[PDB]
Amino acid sequence: SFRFCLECNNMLYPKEDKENQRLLYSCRNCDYTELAEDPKVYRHELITNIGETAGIVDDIGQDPTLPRSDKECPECHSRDCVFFQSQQRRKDTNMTLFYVCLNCKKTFRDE
Amino acid sequence: EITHAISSAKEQVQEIIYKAQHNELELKPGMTLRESFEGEVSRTLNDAR
Numbered sequence A: 001s002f003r004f005c006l007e008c009n010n011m012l013y014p015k016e017d018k019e020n021q022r023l024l025y026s027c028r029n030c031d032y033t034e035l036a037e038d039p040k041v042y043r044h045e046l047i048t049n050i051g052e053t054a055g056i057v058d059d060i061g062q063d064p065t066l067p068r069s070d071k072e073c074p075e076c077h078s079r080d081c082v083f084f085q086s087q088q089r090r091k092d093t094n095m096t097l098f099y100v101c102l103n104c105k106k107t108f109r110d111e
Numbered sequence B: 001e002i003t004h005a006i007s008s009a010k011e012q013v014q015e016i017i018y019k020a021q022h023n024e025l026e027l028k029p030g031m032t033l034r035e036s037f038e039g040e041v042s043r044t045l046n047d048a049r
């Protein structure tokens, strides 16, 4: 997660303080240079799961098309929950489900 | 007899569906989990008919 400039409001890019060997972050517009917290500089993923539980809203109980199941709510023992499968849309994704209770709005699963 | 056979095949398809949803289906070579699920269901229903 890359930050932005406290002065110029642009984005900070990595750099090296060769006289201290500490990863700074250099503004390509201004001369401001702040200390950073995380020495990680890059990431790449192929086995991702972002979009697993993100497909839920507060008023998802108001959707009248979601099928309703009799699974017990682990939270409040509620015998009425709407359910749906993984909102990730890849080809190899599971068919495992997600379960949303209409009482506490806590999401749960059957595992 | 015909309606019993059709009901038995519907139960078989529902069992395949349960197995796929609880992650218990056996994949096939050169074939995805979803393509395996669809192939097994199509096999069951063709044999039902």
Ligand SMILES: [Zn+2]
Pocket: A005, A008, A010, A011, A012, A026, A027, A028, A029, A030, A031, A032
């Ligand atoms: Zn800057």
Ligand SMILES: [Zn+2]
Pocket: A073, A074, A075, A076, A077, A078, A100, A101, A102, A103, A104, A105, A106
């Ligand atoms: Zn609940």
